[PDB]
Amino acid sequence: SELDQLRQEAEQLKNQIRDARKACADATLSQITNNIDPVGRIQMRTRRTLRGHLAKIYAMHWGTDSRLLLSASQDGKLIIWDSYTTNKVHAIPLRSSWVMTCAYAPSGNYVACGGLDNICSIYNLKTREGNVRVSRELAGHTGYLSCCRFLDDNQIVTSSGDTTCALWDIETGQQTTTFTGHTGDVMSLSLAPDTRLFVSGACDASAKLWDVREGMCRQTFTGHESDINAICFFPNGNAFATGSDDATCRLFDLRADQELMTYSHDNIICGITSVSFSKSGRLLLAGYDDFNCNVWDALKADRAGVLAGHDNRVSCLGVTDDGMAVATGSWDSFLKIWN
């Protein structure tokens, strides 16, 4: 029980881990791609404008169909839009205006959200008795709900400011598995394409990969010197991108257990809060704290373009599963579709 010895062993273990990584850190991604011609200047255009919210958009999430999308706003309303016709499919009054995230079930049957209320509310979209009040309210986290992603109609994972992540059984409202490990507020989480694993970023400058079925942490990635605000899984599931306060996006590979590339530039000083890959994973779009968005070239580590021409109006963003569009939310209540 001697703490000194325990925390000492921890340090030596961490030391052993860093060296192992260094032994494998023989080259950077940029070198491997120094022969790959840069992508053409990415200049996306606004196609659709979603008008409805009465306040700052906090989060948004695309549906599997790459058409219907959800958007949580400061106005205390969750709206399901039809990106194609800018029409509002569902309008859902929330009990709080402070919503940090909003998930969309891969079946389109359910939608979820959470925030400073510390609860992950779930709503039923397809029903004779349509739901706008609530189906379930997953209460348990002793901290704000930062992020949540559906696994199916009955299971959903949620990250929280209480330093924990957790898998819930919607039908019971009970916390099936609790993922403990981070030493600070978990800011984001992202499911692997096969949903058997998922990674999470926290205010401890570390991203952790967890095995949903086993309920334990597989690997812990480090590199950022500040809180990791956003995290997004790569399409092939062998890696993921992170965004933190130190104004750098990092690409971590599972097998390598370390960062393959870092994305930054001397002019960039704002912390990154949103990160999303394109369909091919060639572009790493990053939304910064200054409401700007940079389209990075995942391969060459250089920025391929600017999303929204630096109009200081990007609070959140997300890419469609078919990679046909990027949706952005803003402090002025409007959302835009780009491609």
């Binding site: 052993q16 002793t142 924990t164 609790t178 257990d257």
Partner: protein, 65 residues
């Protein structure tokens, strides 16, 4: 697994930490260069079809005028 955070002690937190670390030390780590090669290959194979990179012809753009 089904752990309630606020109830853990400084000790068993470090215990779970060292346990996790021990497990992490035994990780079969792949060479960075190798991983980068595979990453590049995957991307390159699909980059040419990526709508956001190549652009979407107005003809097939779901978000018409």
């Amino acid at each position: 697994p089904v752990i309630n955070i606020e109830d853990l002690t400084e000790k068993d937190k470090l215990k779970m930490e060292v346990d996790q670390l021990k497990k992490e030390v035994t990780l079969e780590r792949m060479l960075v260069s190798k991983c980068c090669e595979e990453f590049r290959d995957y991307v390159e194979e699909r980059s040419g079809e990526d709508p956001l990179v190549k652009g979407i012809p107005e003809d097939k753009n779901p978000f018409k005028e």
